[PDB]
Structure 1
Amino acid sequence: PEIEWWDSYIIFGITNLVEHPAQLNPPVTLGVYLTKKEQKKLRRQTRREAQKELQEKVRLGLMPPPEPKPTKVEAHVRAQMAKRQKAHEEANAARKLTAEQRKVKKIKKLKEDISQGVHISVYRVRNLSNPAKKFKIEANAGQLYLTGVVVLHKDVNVVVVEGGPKAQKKFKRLMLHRIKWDTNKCVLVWEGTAKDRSFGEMKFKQCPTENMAREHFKKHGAEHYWDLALSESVLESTD
């Protein structure tokens, strides 16, 4: 390179002009807590207006008042306490998270808000050709809404995981403590954050030699995880 391009821009381009360039945005709500006495007071006043509005609806006369509580009399009250326990099971029967409201609330528990930046684990394992452990990795990456890849190679196979931080902590609890591996160990190679998510979903790509695995990573703009895990693997193998 003959002269680097700012030097070619000036050789004259200077005078007494300092400038304010193109400000770019960097790439809130607070919960309310109550003391226990305030919980008692809020509960008791909500209940006092609840009793007041139930007695109000009795005062309007929409309905007779609710159920107040030798074989014949407590047989009546047995049918009425069956009615009472049945109404408790009715109020538990509705408001039940029927079959898929559990599913959408488990989803909104597990699917975080990743824009605001995605936390990335990179692991290397010496060998995960075991079917059960590659199933645990694939299924728990899909189920924790974690994205990424497991490229497969001899002596260093790379698990790039990419999701929200509460899922990343569960995946490192899985990968480092829950999956019992054994000379075969799994380490945490990297645990960082990138701007937004790179991979598609947890797909076990594979090539037995290193250059095509780096090419598959370079397709995603993520070759640095491969070069890092490969280089620290071969440095552990030499040391």
Structure 2
Amino acid sequence: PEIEWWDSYIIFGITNLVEHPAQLNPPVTLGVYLTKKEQKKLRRQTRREAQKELQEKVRLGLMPPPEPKDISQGVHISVYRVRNLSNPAKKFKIEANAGQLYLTGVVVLHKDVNVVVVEGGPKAQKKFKRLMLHRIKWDTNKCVLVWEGTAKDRSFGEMKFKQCPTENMAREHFKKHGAEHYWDLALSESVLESTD
């Protein structure tokens, strides 16, 4: 590069002009808790109202008296690394949990590097992490959580078990959905775990 963009724009464009450009917004109900006495008073009032309604209905002659007797505004996106997706029930249970949890993503498999990326709500991501980390029993084959952050919107459409024997094809498939950085970080973490 010969010069930068601001250096080419300035070189004379300096003046005493302060501006406020691009004022954009960044991408509510409160419950009430009632004490035991308040709950008892409400129950008494409701019972009195029901008794009054029954008395009015009986006195009206209508019936005889009873006989005496959100993916928006932030989506939690996790990415885990597994040594072998061979475990059918464990992988199936984790995938089933993610699918039952209205969570999208992908499950890419490779030589000793399996990247399972899920994206959904926080209560679904916590359940998927508890399923993949405590419920799904893998065993040398272990599953660890590589990353867990937040994104603006979901990237993938649905959980599709992709497969690529080489890292370049899986990286291109992740870059087609705009998630090649997480797969590259998972591959780098797998290489650092295998080297150390």
Contact 2:133/2:144, CA 8 A, preserved across alignment: yes
| 1:98-127 per-position Cα deviation (integer Å, ceiling 9, x unaligned) | xxxxxxxxxxxxxxx010110011000000
What is the aligned counterpart of 1:232 among 183, 189, 193? 189
Render the CA deviation track for 1:25-75: whole Å, top value 9, x for unaligned.
Answer: 010110111111000001110110110011100011111110211xxxxxx
Higher relative CO (Cα under 8 Å, sequence separation at least 6) belongs to: 2
Name the % identity: 100
Deviation of 1:129 (Å)? 2.0
Q: CA deviation at 1:138?
A: 2.1
| 1:197, distance to aligned residue in structure 2 (A) | 0.5
Equivalence for 1:15: 15
* 149, 152, 174: which one aligns with 1:217: 174
Q: Which has the larger radius of gyration?
A: 1
- The Cα offsets for residues 136-157 of structure 1, whole Å up to 9 and x where unpaired, read as 1221111011111000011111
Q: Following the alignment from structure 2 to structure 1, what is the Cα–Cα distance between the partners of residues 134 and 82?
A: 13
TM-score (norm 1): 0.81
Describe the superposition over 1:177-218 as per-residue Cα deviations: whole angstroms up to 9, x where unpaired.
Answer: 000110010001001001100011110001011000000000
Aligned partners of 1:220, 1:155: CA distance in 2, in Å? Answer: 23
Q: Supply the RMSD in Å over aligned alpha carbons.
A: 0.8
Off by >4 Å, runs of 4+ in structure 1:
none
CA distance in 2, matches of 1:134, 1:177: 12
CA contact (8 A) 2:91 2:136 kept: no
Alpha-carbon separation, structure 2, partners of 1:216 and 1:137: 22
- The 3-state SS of whatever aligns with 1:19 is strand
* Higher share in helix: 1
TM-superposed CA distance for 1:160, in Å, is 0.2
> Is the CA contact (8 Å cut-off) linking 2:87 and 2:138 kept in structure 1?
no
User: Runs of 5+ in structure 2 lacking a partner?
Assistant: none
Aligned equivalent of 1:150: 107
Distance 1:202 1:147 in 2: 5
Count of residue correspondences = 196
- The more displaced of 129-138 and 189-198 is 129-138
- The TM-score, its normalising length taken from structure 2, stands at 0.98
